[PDB]
Write a protein that binds this ligand. Structure first.
Ligand code: A1BO0
Ligand code: ZN
Length: 139
């Protein structure tokens, strides 16, 4: 679990969005596993606007942060799950690092700010949904 809180927005994994997220919907994209909802309070986070390919993510299943080298956002095949049919997920970045079911929502950061959130993984890989192209989160 986990979310990004920036301005009057909350960014979560679309498959973990709550009834309240859907009632306050701003934007969602199944192909990215992202949903953005509106908030009443001002958020604590800031968003990176960069092309970094290294950073640090939070791994809830280890209660620890780990450094990672990750691929640029791209279209990557994701096998069927209870939440989605077998499909290509867009704007996804992969890295070698531990993740297991339950780690979705952990934040990836570089020196410029928040880069994305954990969205998939397995077998020593971790995959992050990128948010750096969503320039409207800043206004
Ligand atoms: N983005 C998606 O389509 C995910 C929706 C939830 C389901 N998806 C998964 O990957 C579930 C899953 N099985 C093994 C692992 C290991 C690490 C992590 Br993080 C998640 N994992 C796929
Ligand atoms: Zn950066």
């Amino acid at each position: 679990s986990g979310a990004i809180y920036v301005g009057n927005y909350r960014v979560v994994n679309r498959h973990l969005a709550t009834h309240n997220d859907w009632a306050n919907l701003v934007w969602e994209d199944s192909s990215r596993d992202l949903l953005v909802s509106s908030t009443t309070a001002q958020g604590c986070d800031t968003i990176a606007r960069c092309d970094c390919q290294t950073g640090v993510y939070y791994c809830s299943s280890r209660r620890k942060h780990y450094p990672v080298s990750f691929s640029k956002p791209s279209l990557i095949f994701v096998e069927a799950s209870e939440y989605y049919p077998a499909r290509y997920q867009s704007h996804l970045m992969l890295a070698v690092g531990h993740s297991e079911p339950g780690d979705c929502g952990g934040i990836l950061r570089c020196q410029h700010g928040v880069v994305g959130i954990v969205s998939t993984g397995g077998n020593g890989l971790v995959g992050f949904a990128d948010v750096r192209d969503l320039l409207w989160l800043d206004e």
